[PDB]
Design a binder for this molecule. Structure first.
Ligand SMILES: OC[C@H]1O[C@@H](O)[C@H](O)[C@@H](O)[C@@H]1O
Ligand SMILES: OC[C@H]1O[C@@H](O)[C@H](O)[C@@H](O)[C@@H]1O
Ligand SMILES: OC[C@H]1O[C@@H](O)[C@H](O)[C@@H](O)[C@@H]1O
Ligand SMILES: [Ca+2]
Lengths: 705, 702
């Protein structure tokens, strides 16, 4: 059942700490490694910066001949001497608050304009932002790999070295995302045109899908500018599919290059998306990796968690992200490649009290491994800091190797993990609720995001009213997922793409947050799910279009639903809850045929029904709610209770979060107080026990079954 | 010298609680009022919703004839019986998460298209958003005033009644701001044309300023779409000046109508701008009231503070907003018309332990009065809630008058306030730093804001690189003001408009965050300031343009400055601090004749100088830094120390914030812990422990 890392045929919690040799006095490297090992950590992790080691074009130093902290070889040897396994991350990009994101200054001065990401006008977006498939960029990247990869290969575990894992590049697409502009480099334009010709084969076939009138493929260009017609939406949809293939081509090229050096260790990649302490856009960025995860079962993706604080304001972000990684990568453990320790920026504090709670909450939320980022502070040598001289603050160790407050928090957490890992790693929560992940709603990084400078998608111009980004942020991430976690109902997330019917029928309920569009394959899957005995909850819309916004009424027809879309007050009544505020004036009005009406508009028109279809049950709500009122929690709770799903515990304070993890031998009860209140409460399993929990604090109770 | 409310001829801290009679079971009105009074509160505050009382056109109920909670008259009687003064807020707009923002449904169903705020295409922006100077809207507003104002007039403090203050409308421009669109209603456009003719007199004068090619004012159109040309910037700038006159015309029309009923109590207005627990846009919104504040010294503006939490993440917002209100309104107390109690949003928690600290921090930060918003929760009657059934959560009292956790926090704070008010209200901080407030940098709500749906202002299209909203948000509000607060250096803010030279001379340093444009009057003011002996810190640019982007180099020439704008790495060195991250590649590179170079690019070009001019001192930095590294705090500290300015205390833990407030005989030291850490420290001009997100106040007799 559970996915976890294994060592010596036993479950093993991966505990790594990030220690940047290049930012630490090499006379203190050993002390940093000893103090990390003394916390119970098994692994150390570092970037190997291209700029740091290719000091001028074709002049390499890995031995500290020109600066003692260029002695990568000695750092590798110390990791082995201090019995730590090593994760190496040689880029080409590292980010790492390093000048030019780790690319050499000499490189960026030499590269031609066509090596850079370009805007719609052909202008350079940023002087450190390359176009990934640039011939010149990949030539210099390969020359870098030619010098660093033999060193990595020599020091792998299979040659009795400490190196067990290597990250390829760093958060692919993060630089493009943060710039707020997409890449229109000519390599992108030309590879896109090849993609479209391969995809459609004839211009007649493309025109039939898009409803365009092109005479030839030579008339068609990568889409630019705002979406005004459904044909512009179609063009951008394919452009999103293309970018997923483009990032798969990039990582495939790096992987094939590294394998040529005899490097057989585990390859990793790291997922961006937290900003200002929440992760509602992370699902968009993880979706850009869809083709990499389909084609490379041997690259393990891990999350980059940057909570910044730990409170009800962001409590749901880490669990939703952990669940969405599991959905997209169900055969590998859920791990954090970067797991916040300290703060990347002086003005954004990172308190030990918060992060210690985050670490325990992460265990509650199913994490199987992590890399404390940053375990060790660094001091940039030679002006290499992007933003200042000091690299991170409020870490476990300062750059000198002094213990800071966070060290004691990590020791406490790691001690618990080491004591419990053989049982805890094998535990699961009992999820009776499955939530669908429909990746195409996330495919909007070119047209609609929190970071994109230009809003290119306005669905009203297309005759639609449900924006897929509004749906996936407010109705799903901040809405349903936040609500279920707040209500202490366990859920799983399943990727609906090529999804096995047998993997949905384990759940008492499947929840689908739907826009007006959904592909035929997914409409058919949800149809079969209900006909064969599944219980489906679907809102705010029965879809009637496919991903190209062409007619597709499969689910509507299979479920025998008739509806009209009508304007009314935002407030509806649902299951006897009055004044439920909904997101839209427009609602689906269902006729009551062979159904029980359960939701009504202010004019008493039917906007939600329940029915029995084949061996299954359907609940459809023709209105949108996330979690912006107490009525929304009441409605989620009522929906869950339709199939008699029960919480694992009765807890006297509804603002206490809990998670029960168990196997045949052991039960762990995690209590999380995400609130600035001392809470005294009682609980019992579904004679009560009393607990007092401080503000922003945790309790963990272990029972031997 | 301090400004404060007065009761019984003594300094009086205004402690008001918001209690919406229209959202409370009338059987429990007395119980809510008694529980509010038992916290030591002196005043209760409420809207009087137009929709609630004009139940159909020309059918008024203020006596509970049709619903017991329409008995406004009984509520007023209970306030008197329970010895509370009353603040009333009859609109016409109330917002208050009330359907139609408090306008009657029957009114919105009946109004013509031309009564509504319209976008660039002539479409209605929102079915509850009227154009303020709509004739139809003012006709019906006046008929509402005709019924509610005689009731207020009878019960006003000038007739020895309980009503001490009345708010006119609610956060003027807030609906416009939140809609993300500006009003192009044809009456508004006609008033804008009248405003332009009044301002320029002749089309030749307007053409000389804008570089336009009109033959007459008949050719003139309201600016729309993106700014591509400097002439489009000019038209939008005057469109901003016009909206400030427009809001003054609206509030003048309401005030004159109110005064006609013999209402001579204090009139108020309330300032919006907090969102997601910070207030970096509130200075833009307060700038929209510039003409109201200049023309109506009898209308007291108060702040609507919505911190949501209390930590280092938002510690600087309330101080900066309080200081900006003081700059724009120096002759009235700084007070919060809405002072967060509970939460408007169930999913956005408001912890009693957070807000208790916010209340004490607000005292440290110079607040003189406030209105707990919401003291009492409400239940929306008859589906009249904009949102769900319940109005506010985690308040002092629930809608049934049950005491909640916040009640005891408010009782505690109120007891400290009543014990200390006579001395505390007469205290000020000793500011030796003044920070300039240049209002034109804030006049962008039509073209650039956090809420505007399309950015119309792209300064690179105008041949500029310093965006005024970036400057005022990241370099000023979240940069310099946050850094000074964090470093525990007192500052004052001064409005540079019509500013007295005499008012700047008391300060040891004037800090000016400058874009490439600044009007002649302000350039002249800053020139005279330094020549006469003042010490000026100016960055990131010596301005070379006026507000119409026409050449204006008064300050530059008067100070003998020469520069070239050149591209370099973002990092500079300044005062021996290496690796100072700056916002722009473009920097001013100064000629150093008769100057001391003090900052350098990565290629060692001079991007900052110090100089003696007349009797004074100039420090100019040709680069933009906010607060995103420890080097930024070090640079601000180095700059303050150029004129030997000292903190009032030595505190062993640099992450403890303090404010020293004094008068001739009393000192209050407010220690504030904005961090999730128990901190132990000592202080001197003596060892204290403060819990996470908490406070300690110390008194010292002088
Ligand atoms: O916060 C925005 C982004 O900043 C980047 O520097 C981090 O590497 C990402 O993980 C993060 O999502
Ligand atoms: O077990 C001791 C731990 O208890 C938790 O409840 C607290 O949040 C931690 O601050 C503390 O280290
Ligand atoms: O948060 C955005 C705005 O919301 C409005 O409902 C409040 O009345 C304002 O004070 C506030 O700034
Ligand atoms: Ca000169």
């Amino acid at each position: 059942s559970e996915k976890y890392f294994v060592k010596n045929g036993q479950p093993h919690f991966l505990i790594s700490g990030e220690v940047h040799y290049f930012r630490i006095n090499p006379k203190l490297w050993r002390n940093h490694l000893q103090l990390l090992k003394q916390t119970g950590a098994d692994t150390v992790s570092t970037y190997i910066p291209w700029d740091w080691h290719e000091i001028e074009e074709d002049d390499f130093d890995f031995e500290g001949k020109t600066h003692p902290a260029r002695n990568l070889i000695r750092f590798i040897k110390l990791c082995k001497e201090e019995n730590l396994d090593l994760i190496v991350k040689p880029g080409p990009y590292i980010l790492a608050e390093y000048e030019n994101q780790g690319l050499p200054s000499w490189l960026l001065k030499k590269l031609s304009k066509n090596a850079f990401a370009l805007d719609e006008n052909g202008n350079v977006i940023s002087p450190d932002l390359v176009s990934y498939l640039s011939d010149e960029f990949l030539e210099y990247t390969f020359k870098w790999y030619d010098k660093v990869m033999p060193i990595i290969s020599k020091h792998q575990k299979e040659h009795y070295g400490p190196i067990t894992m290597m990250q390829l590049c760093n958060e692919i697409g993060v630089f493009q995302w943060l710039s707020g502009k997409s890449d229109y480099n000519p390599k992108v334009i030309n590879l896109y045109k090849e993609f479209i010709i391969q995809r459609y084969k004839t211009i007649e076939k493309l025109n039939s899908v898009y409803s365009t009138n092109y005479n030839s493929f030579d008339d068609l260009k990568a889409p630019s500018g705002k979406i005004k017609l459904r044909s512009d939406y179609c063009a951008y949809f394919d452009f999103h599919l293309f970018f997923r293939e483009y990032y798969n081509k990039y990582i495939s090229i790096l992987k094939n290059k590294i394998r040529s050096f005899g490097i057989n260790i585990k390859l990793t990649h790291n997922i961006p998306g937290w900003i200002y302490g929440n992760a509602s856009e992370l699902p968009m960025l993880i979706s850009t990796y869809s083709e990499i995860m389909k084609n490379h079962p041997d690259i393990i993706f891990g999350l980059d968690h940057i909570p910044e604080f730990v409170s009800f304001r962001n409590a749901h972000s880490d669990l939703a992200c952990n669940k969405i990684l599991e959905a997209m990568q169900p055969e590998a453990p859920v791990w954090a490649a970067e797991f916040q320790a300290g703060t990347r920026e002086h003005h954004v504090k990172a308190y030990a009290k918060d992060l210690e709670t985050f670490y325990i909450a992460s265990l509650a939320h199913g994490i199987k491994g992590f890399n404390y980022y940053m375990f060790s502070q660094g001091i940039n040598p030679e002006g290499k800091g992007f933003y200042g001289k000091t690299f991170y603050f409020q870490t476990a160790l300062d750059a000198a190797s002094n213990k800071l407050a966070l060290y004691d928090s990590i020791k406490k957490v790691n001690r618990f993990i080491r004591k419990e890992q053989k049982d805890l790693l094998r535990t699961n929560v009992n999820s009776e609720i499955c939530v669908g992940f429909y990746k195409p709603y996330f495919f909007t990084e070119l047209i609609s995001s929190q970071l994109l400078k230009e809003k290119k998608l306005n669905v009203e111009e297309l005759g639609l009213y449900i924006d897929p980004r509004f749906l996936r942020e407010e109705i799903l991430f901040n809405g349903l997922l936040r609500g279920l976690q707040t209500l202490n109902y366990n859920y799983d997330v399943v990727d609906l793409e090529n999804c096995d019917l047998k993997s949905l029928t384990a759940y008492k309920q499947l929840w689908i947050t739907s826009a007006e569009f959904m592909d035929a394959e997914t409409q058919n899957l949800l149809s079969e799910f209900v006909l064969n005995g599944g219980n489906l909850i679907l809102y705010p819309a029965v879809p009637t279009l496919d991903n190209y916004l062409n007619r597709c009424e499969i689910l509507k027809n299979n479920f025998g639903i008739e509806f009209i879309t009508k304007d009314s007050s935002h407030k509806v009544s649902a299951f006897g809850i009055e004044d439920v505020f909904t997101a839209f004036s427009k609602k689906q009005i269902y006729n009551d045929t062979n159904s029980k009406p359960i939701a009504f508009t202010q004019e008493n028109e039917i906007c939600g029904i329940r029915k029995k279809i084949g061996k299954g049950e359907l609940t459809i709500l023709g209105f949108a709610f996330g979690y912006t009122s107490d009525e929304h929690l009441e409605l989620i709770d009522k929906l869950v209770k339709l199939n008699k799903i029960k919480r694992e515990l009765f807890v006297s304070d509804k603002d206490i979060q809990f998670v029960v993890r168990e196997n045949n031998k052991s039960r762990y009860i995690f209590f999380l107080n995400y609130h600035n209140e001392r809470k005294t409460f009682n609980y019992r399993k579904s004679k009560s026990e009393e607990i007092s929990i401080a503000p922003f604090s945790y309790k963990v109770i272990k029972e031997n079954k």
